Design an enzyme around this catalytic site. Sequence first.
Site, short mmCIF file in Angstrom:
data_model
loop_
_atom_site.label_atom_id
_atom_site.label_comp_id
_atom_site.label_asym_id
_atom_site.label_seq_id
_atom_site.Cartn_x
_atom_site.Cartn_y
_atom_site.Cartn_z
N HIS A 178 11.21 -40.81 32.99
CA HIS A 178 10.19 -40.22 32.08
C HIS A 178 10.24 -40.89 30.71
O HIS A 178 9.41 -40.54 29.88
CB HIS A 178 10.29 -38.69 31.99
CG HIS A 178 11.47 -38.15 31.26
ND1 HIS A 178 12.50 -37.50 31.91
CD2 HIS A 178 11.72 -38.00 29.94
CE1 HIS A 178 13.37 -37.05 31.02
NE2 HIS A 178 12.92 -37.36 29.81
N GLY A 197 17.48 -35.12 22.27
CA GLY A 197 17.99 -36.50 22.39
C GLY A 197 19.11 -36.63 23.42
O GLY A 197 19.76 -37.71 23.45
N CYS A 217 18.73 -36.15 26.84
CA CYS A 217 18.23 -36.73 28.11
C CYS A 217 18.99 -38.01 28.43
O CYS A 217 19.06 -38.90 27.55
CB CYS A 217 16.75 -37.04 28.08
SG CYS A 217 15.75 -35.68 27.41
C1 ALD Z 1 15.57 -33.89 27.10
O1 ALD Z 1 15.86 -33.59 28.22
C2 ALD Z 1 14.12 -33.87 26.67
C3 ALD Z 1 14.06 -32.73 25.65
C4 ALD Z 1 12.71 -32.58 24.96
C5 ALD Z 1 12.75 -31.41 23.97
C6 ALD Z 1 12.31 -33.88 24.28
N1 ALD Z 1 13.32 -33.58 27.85
C7 ALD Z 1 12.04 -34.18 28.15
O2 ALD Z 1 11.53 -34.97 27.42
C8 ALD Z 1 11.31 -33.73 29.43
C9 ALD Z 1 10.24 -34.74 29.83
C10 ALD Z 1 9.83 -34.61 31.29
C11 ALD Z 1 11.01 -34.25 32.18
C12 ALD Z 1 8.72 -33.59 31.45
N2 ALD Z 1 10.67 -32.49 29.10
C13 ALD Z 1 11.45 -31.29 29.04
O3 ALD Z 1 12.62 -31.32 29.25
C14 ALD Z 1 10.78 -29.98 28.67
C15 ALD Z 1 11.20 -29.69 27.23
C16 ALD Z 1 10.30 -28.70 26.49
C17 ALD Z 1 11.08 -28.06 25.34
C18 ALD Z 1 9.07 -29.41 25.95
N3 ALD Z 1 11.32 -28.98 29.56
C19 ALD Z 1 10.47 -27.92 30.04
O4 ALD Z 1 9.97 -27.19 29.25
O5 ALD Z 1 10.28 -27.72 31.42
C20 ALD Z 1 8.98 -27.93 31.92
C21 ALD Z 1 8.09 -26.73 31.61
C22 ALD Z 1 6.84 -26.94 31.02
C23 ALD Z 1 6.03 -25.86 30.73
C24 ALD Z 1 6.44 -24.57 31.05
C25 ALD Z 1 7.67 -24.36 31.64
C26 ALD Z 1 8.49 -25.44 31.93
MG MG Z 2 12.62 -38.21 34.63
#
Ligand code: ALD
Ligand code: MG
Lengths: 300, 300
Positions: free
Chosen positions: B40, B142, B144
């Site tokens: 991702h 950060g 991930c």
């Molecule tokens: C680190 O893991 C990073 C953290 C974020 C806060 C930047 N994760 C991602 O970028 C990841 C990208 C891909 C896997 C979609 N997104 C998520 O981990 C996401 C973080 C939220 C705080 C934006 N997780 C999440 O919410 O699960 C999916 C979801 C979406 C909508 C409703 C319920 C669940």
């Molecule tokens: Mg991924």
Amino acid sequence: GFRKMAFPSGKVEGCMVQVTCGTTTLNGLWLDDVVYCPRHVICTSEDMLNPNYEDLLIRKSNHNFLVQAGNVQLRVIGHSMQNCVLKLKVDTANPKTPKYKFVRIQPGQTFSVLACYNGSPSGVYQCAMRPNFTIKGSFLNGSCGSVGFNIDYDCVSFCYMHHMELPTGVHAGTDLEGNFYGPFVDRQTAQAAGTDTTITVNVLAWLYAAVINGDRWFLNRFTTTLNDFNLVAMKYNYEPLTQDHVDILGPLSAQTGIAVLDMCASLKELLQNGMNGRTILGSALLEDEFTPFDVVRQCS
Amino acid sequence: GFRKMAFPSGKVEGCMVQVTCGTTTLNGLWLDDVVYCPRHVICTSEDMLNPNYEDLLIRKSNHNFLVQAGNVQLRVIGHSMQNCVLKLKVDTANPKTPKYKFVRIQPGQTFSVLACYNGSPSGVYQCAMRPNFTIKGSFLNGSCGSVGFNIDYDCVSFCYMHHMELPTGVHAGTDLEGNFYGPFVDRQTAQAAGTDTTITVNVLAWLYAAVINGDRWFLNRFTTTLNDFNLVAMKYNYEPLTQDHVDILGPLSAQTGIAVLDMCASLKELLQNGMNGRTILGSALLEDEFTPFDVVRQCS
Ligand SMILES: *[C@H](O)[C@H](CC(C)C)NC(=O)[C@H](CC(C)C)NC(=O)[C@H](CC(C)C)NC(=O)OCc1ccccc1
Ligand SMILES: [Mg+2]
Ligand SMILES: *[C@H](O)[C@H](CC(C)C)NC(=O)[C@H](CC(C)C)NC(=O)[C@H](CC(C)C)NC(=O)OCc1ccccc1
Ligand SMILES: [Mg+2]
């Protein structure tokens, strides 16, 4: 969900060596050209009741000490003694000697222990120095000489060395200047710890963590004076809160917009009424092993 | 006193790199000549609802990816995709590549996470894969690409990579073959975890730790069948106990001389009557984040 985290142990993993003296081995720390370890390595089992450590040290020769850095052997060329710490001068400077301070921590401050068996890193954990200057670790045979540290930017800040341990997981030990935390001596006589109190400023920190992480149920409308908080605190074996501790909570007070003496009023009610079977960051107990800085560095 | 301990993180600290692709950076793992990270990384913020990862991967060139190992830059010479994991071939083999397996763990099994910010090791913790295949970690922006591992003798056993995180500290992620633990996909749609059950065999392990450490108050005279334990267990959201799990408790059953189905009868009563405000290894809660092997390796 809020992880108690240790520092990555890489830099300390380098510095760890096995020290032997008769049928007694434990762990040493190797910074520049000096191998630091507990001086009770020079004792027989027979002579630990009241060793005369200088007389014991005098009867040993530079070549009495088997220092091993791996399966490799090391060359000892000067035994010295600072307080309860044996400083062995050796041949070969530690290539891996990171930037470091020897530092002394106050009660309630946290650090990472690299637990080692016979010179071999085994495990890492985060603890607080209790107010009675003991460490609730795991009781592990062969873990004498294991060190506590904080990693501040580039700098491995060494603060602790394990000297003595109880089956209760209760450890005591020294700074790297060889002075005990608390009223402890490195001989096997009966020894009382002080009364172990709850680290009030750390509980407040962790209620600020709980807020930052979206747990608000314990936040009441009310407020208190530092003196009237301390009346209650001391009823429940909490350390009195100091103006200096009120200050180091400032940054969390600003991040959350909850004044320190408001969070204190929140804590007072939790003490006076209990948790009501309810849960904070999925704990039944109020937790005191996070410093304000532990929360800041983790909650950003 | 009984410390939850992580593995020393030295060997994994080596293998950690910062991977960038536009204004998206996260952590990668560097074993021999392949830099593993969450796929991702190749997404815009705009295109995370339902990315076509192959179409996104096709529009990227070997030189689209900024891999950094320190302040040093790294040379990418082949992007590939295994499941939800980006395998970048690079110039320079990792000098530090320890002995390793890529392994898949079962629910209830424990491992160490080296938490990293932007390629920089930050903290280490011990967790269990929950039965619903989520990780209760700290929510850290950060983090991930941070990996879970067990260190078995010489061998860094890599089992986990963080893909997605919630403010509840609830993480999901893949093995290093890029397959999710649990029913999760790497796109931002609503996603339900299963019901999170208590890891029965781990609680039993920890009652054996409690005994080995001299806490006997919960040991009753009584005994039970596996079926009648499981009737009660499932009333209290405990996983059913299996004959295979009864077997891996064998060595603790022998060390303490308490038969597994006797400790089960001990656990049944704690469930049916609660703790009575009383304490086991100074916990209000029955703890499920120690495996039988976690106890064996620590209780010797
Ligand atoms: C680190 O893991 C990073 C953290 C974020 C806060 C930047 N994760 C991602 O970028 C990841 C990208 C891909 C896997 C979609 N997104 C998520 O981990 C996401 C973080 C939220 C705080 C934006 N997780 C999440 O919410 O699960 C999916 C979801 C979406 C909508 C409703 C319920 C669940
Ligand atoms: Mg991924
Ligand atoms: C590791 O630290 C090592 C563990 C032992 C089990 C080998 N500690 C020592 O060798 C140390 C030697 C010096 C400091 C006396 N002794 C202890 O740590 C001792 C361990 C017990 C289990 C024998 N700790 C101790 O019990 O405190 C002193 C004491 C003696 C008698 C009554 C109360 C307290
Ligand atoms: Mg000593």
